[PDB]
Amino acid sequence: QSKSRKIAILGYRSVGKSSLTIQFVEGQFVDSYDPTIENTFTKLITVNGQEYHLQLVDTAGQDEYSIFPQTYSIDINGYILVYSVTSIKSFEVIKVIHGKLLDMVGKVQIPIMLVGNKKDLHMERVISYEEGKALAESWNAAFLESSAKENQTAVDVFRRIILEAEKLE
Numbered sequence: 001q002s003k004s005r006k007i008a009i010l011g012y013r014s015v016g017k018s019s020l021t022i023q024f025v026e027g028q029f030v031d032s033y034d035p036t037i038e039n040t041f042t043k044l045i046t047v048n049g050q051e052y053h054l055q056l057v058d059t060a061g062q063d064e065y066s067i068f069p070q071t072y073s074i075d076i077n078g079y080i081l082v083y084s085v086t087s088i089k090s091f092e093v094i095k096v097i098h099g100k101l102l103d104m105v106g107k108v109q110i111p112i113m114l115v116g117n118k119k120d121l122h123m124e125r126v127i128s129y130e131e132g133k134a135l136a137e138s139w140n141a142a143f144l145e146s147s148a149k150e151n152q153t154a155v156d157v158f159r160r161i162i163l164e165a166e167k168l169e
């Protein structure tokens with residue numbers, strides 16, 4: 001009576017893909033972590049009384065020139081696209097990543113969740129909550145800001161993509 005889902009985490013380098021995922025999976029804010037390796041974490045979570053077996057694909061990250069690997073579109077039930085609120089570059093790149101993703105999958109009307117990470121770095125913020133929300137609305141995607149240092153924000157992100165998936169289902 002369990003349900004397995006595979007979620008791919010995408011985004012520009014250093015926006016916090018690994019840190020967010022690991023904060024969710026192990027409940028800890030890791031300080032150091034290999035900058036390039038693509039790894040698939042496993043996580044068990046019960047949402048709405050429903051148990052889920054999650055496979056979280058923490059990708060190596062991509063940019064305007066990346067050529068999406070097949071592993072980005074096979075058996076993926078949902079995608080989390082993250083950018084850093086401290087980087088306009090990561091924000092402009094997440095738009096390109098979204099476009100490439102739609103090109104690679106087609107019109108599958110895939111479940112997508114946009115995430116503006118690093119919200120704790122108040123001083124270095126350059127992307128507003130409104131800009132992030134406007135983008136998500138442009139895509140009709142879920143939206144949330146987060147901080148790999150605040151476990152509850154990381155949990156909300158993953159719970160949210162699960163609901164988006166169920167909704168599009």
Ligand SMILES: Nc1nc2c(ncn2[C@@H]2O[C@H](COP(=O)(O)OP(=O)(O)O)[C@@H](O)[C@H]2O)c(=O)[nH]1
Nearest residue numbers: 013014015016017018019117118146147148149
């Ligand atoms: N302050 C702060 N630093 C973060 C956050 N998320 C990631 N980082 C830091 O940003 C750097 C890159 O994070 P990492 O997860 O490796 O990025 P990735 O390449 O997107 O997976 C590391 O030095 C992290 O400690 C966050 O929410 N807040």
Ligand SMILES: [Mg+2]
Nearest residue numbers: 017018034035
């Ligand atoms: Mg990483």
